[PDB]
Design a protein around this ligand. Structure first.
Ligand SMILES: Nc1cccc(C(=O)N2CCC(CCCCNC(=O)/C=C/c3cccnc3)CC2)c1
Ligand SMILES: Nc1cccc(C(=O)N2CCC(CCCCNC(=O)/C=C/c3cccnc3)CC2)c1
Lengths: 469, 471
């Protein structure tokens, strides 16, 4: 079972002995520090509040387990047993913490307060930063959701330019990342974050997480279709690739079906197998049930362009109302190898230059989508900005000489709309002056309870692109 | 609760309809594919997966029904192999009819070798082998963390031995700072445990419980830490009182090593004029067991380390060790734990060496670089079907994409062997059966729902030792 007393960085065990004597308040905040990626989608806090922070999180057994572990880990008795016991006894093991946060799905420029944390009992001054470690992990769903939304912006731009509309947008970036993340837990968190922006996923773990922690009106938040893998083609033998293809598209004759076509020779597969031997099985398919040809190797742009050129010579191409070429409706491509935000841009731009509509393609992304991301992409960071010691509040901050980008904010913070409707973070308690209206942060956790929450449907609404609105 | 029926890539739900008819066996393997440097990989983490997710009764009627219900909506179609999952429930009380054979954990194996194989033990469950690809391929993560951590240990060992003449302290020279910087609690425990294969210092507490539960150590714990400050504990004093914070902290922890982040405002002033003058008397009186460890945390990591050492060498008595390298007094050391990854680590120790500073002077912390800034394509960790039985005939299967020979997979039944010169070879096409190469190094570790062979964390560490530590 999870034990919050064992879910912090080791050094934080020792911090209660380091703050100024008679400190009754430690007040901290989270931002995606300013330094590409100008605005971040705030998502994932609610998962952490519910799974890890709410309710009775301290027990006698957890305190004893922690004590025993830390005694050996530090080769010394430095653990605040009394401090944890106080929480157990006074609050029935509910954390005396208040968290205020911007609504989930909100899209906020860099360098703004996203949430704040403070203790609600003077005895628990040390608890605010105990829980930095677990809260800072919100970087991950924030960053996944942000980077996925940034890819959506690219796809929207190019789809609108090449087709005149956004039809199909929220299926154009499919999550392939389940195997390529670091754990089952990560898989669910990251896949949920991608689903803020798109509807297509193979990372099944995302569905249960959303259902449990956020909720949707629809039975599920994301969808998939049948598709082949190398094992299901290659198992037939090298000389029987055509047989595998015929079997699979016949098994799935009335739903869209993706078929990995590069086991031996993508270009032969497209030109000869699909384009000649099995063409009669493709041209007969419903518009609601296309064959989706999947290359999976080689230079992504060059491979997509060559696959399209092949198919456009074997199948009847049309020219849409914008002047771009369009495969027949029973035939599409999915490129799901080497896709990240940079190659995504390269591919759609190269397709546009060769007069191929983005309607012809969808993308899959695995590691690029869910794994090839770090906390330093958006500089997601938690810092103390205010303390009260001997009854006096002081504004506190770091400001390292050699790196002004690491300067932190001072004092009590609030988030506001400017007169032009942008965001601003007021420091030093200046929000109290009421020159910029009401604080946009809401209390979402207090004293062991989640006090405000968002459905997944609301999060999605909040995270929509302008071009969509 | 975890449901293995919902723990696969969605498309794999449809694959039972795609394999050739009359297929009784699907046999697949995992490797860290070679790429025409990370030449060798530490095999670690499978045992976690086997125990946590794969062993015992993993199928129930309720799990079947919930998968069925989710998949109907997710696919907008009924494609789920309810019959096949029910078969396992009724026939094997929900235990997976799968055999997995693996190289022992901690083993260090060159790229492009079989590390483990998976096959179904019941013909009806031909589809189950690749169902569990997704969950098993996540072993990429502990392998990669353990590998990348070991490659960093190789760099540290080289420069420590050069600058000092020995490896003392090596075991503590790369500390895990990564708990906040990973994507989840579960990742934290897995990655931290992988780093501890190579080192003994960690602040990622999650790693300890994982090792205790799934591997085990003769010692009470596998990893250790010391007291240390963060910006909050310094800055909470007010800037004008940074010296008061330092004094308070080193006096609180006067008898153990203590790390004190020193860059809140001006790292150079803190070193030269706070530690180097105002509080010097509290540092020179410390035990060799209980040094002050000054922690910069900003600026160019090499430049900052070199400037910090230059300042400290002017304020504190420096000696020259027997190799000619400068050494701080024993009550004073440095920890650099900003911007550290395998590339910057190398830069910093080389820069130190060029300026005649012993690596004895320094330890490193690494967070995102150690545990998060890694992907499955670093070592090309990959799982592929290499053998099937169809109509009772075994056939060697493989991929070989025309545009990428690096993605060619191995053929047939595989086995891993020592070569006559003591290297490793993977034999393909069942050639291991010829017995020209001594015993297969793959052992059965899972069979029909049971974990059949386990390794302690101690054994894993032994297996993963560096040669230089052997020598
Ligand atoms: N306009 C346009 C253009 C392209 C297509 C379409 C269209 O019909 N759809 C949009 C795409 C949507 C999903 C397709 C997933 C296919 N699945 C795979 O390829 C699975 C691979 C995989 C690989 C590795 C790991 N896990 C899974 C089906 C509907 C429309
Ligand atoms: N030769 C030599 C050279 C350098 C030192 C030493 C020496 O005494 N040791 C080696 C190092 C070992 C551990 C020190 C960790 C200190 N912890 C921190 O700085 C924690 C920071 C942090 C930051 C972010 C997230 N989590 C934690 C103490 C023993 C010997």
């Amino acid at each position: 079972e999870f034990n919050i007393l064992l879910a912090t960085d080791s050094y934080k065990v020792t911090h209660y002995k380091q703050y100024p004597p008679n400190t009754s308040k430690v007040y901290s905040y989270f931002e995606c520090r300013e330094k590409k990626y100008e605005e971040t989608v705030f998502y994932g806090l609610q998962y952490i509040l519910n799974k890890y922070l709410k309710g009775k999180v301290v027990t006698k057994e957890k305190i004893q387990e922690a004590k025993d572990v830390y005694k050996e880990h530090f080769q010394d008795d430095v653990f605040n047993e009394k401090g944890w016991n106080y929480i157990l006894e006074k609050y029935d093991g509910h954390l005396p913490i208040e968290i205020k946060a911007v609504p989930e799905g909100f899209v906020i420029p860099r360098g703004n307060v996203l949430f704040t944390v403070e203790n609600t009992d003077p005895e628990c001054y040390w608890l605010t930063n105990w829980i930095e470690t677990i809260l800072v992990q919100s970087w991950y769903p924030i960053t996944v959701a942000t980077n996925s939304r940034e890819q959506k912006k690219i796809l929207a731009k190019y789809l609108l330019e090449t087709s005149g509309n956004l039809d199909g947008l929220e299926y154009k970036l499919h999550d392939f990342g389940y195997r390529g993340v670091s754990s089952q837990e990560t898989a669910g968190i990251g896949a949920s974050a991608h689903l803020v922006n798109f509807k297509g996923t193979d990372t099944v773990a995302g569905l249960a997480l959303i259902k449990k922690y956020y909720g949707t009106k629809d039975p599920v938040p994301g969808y998939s279709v049948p598709a082949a893998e190398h094992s299901t083609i290659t198992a037939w033998g090298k000389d029987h690739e055509k047989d595998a293809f015929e079997h699979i598209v016949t098994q799935f004759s009335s739903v869209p079906v993706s078929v990995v076509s590069d086991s031996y020779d993508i270009y032969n597969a497209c030109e000869k197998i699909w384009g000649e031997d099995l063409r009669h099985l493709i041209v007969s398919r419903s518009t609601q049930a296309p064959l989706i040809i999947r290359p999976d190797s080689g230079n992504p742009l060059d491979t997509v362009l060559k696959v399209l050129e092949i198919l456009g010579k074997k199948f009847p191409v049309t020219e849409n109302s914008k002047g771009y070429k369009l495969l027949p409706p029973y035939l599409r491509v999915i490129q799901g190898d080497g896709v990240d935000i940079n190659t995504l841009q390269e591919i759609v731009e190269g397709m546009k230059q060769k007069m191929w509509s983005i309607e012809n393609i969808a993308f899959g992304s695995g590691g690029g989508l869910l794994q090839k991301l770090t906390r330093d992409l958006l500089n997601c960071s938690f810092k103390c900005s205010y303390v009260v010691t001997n009854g006096l509040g002081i504004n506190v901050f770091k400001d390292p000489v050699a790196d002004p980008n690491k300067r932190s904010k001072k004092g009590r913070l609030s988030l506001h709309r400017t007169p032009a409707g942008n965001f601003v973070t007021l420091e030093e308690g200046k929000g109290d002056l009421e020159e910029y209206g009401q604080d946009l942060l809401h209390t979402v956790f207090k004293n062991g309870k989640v006090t405000k929450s968002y459905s997944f449907d609301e999060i999605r609404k909040n995270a929509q692109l302008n071009i969509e609105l």
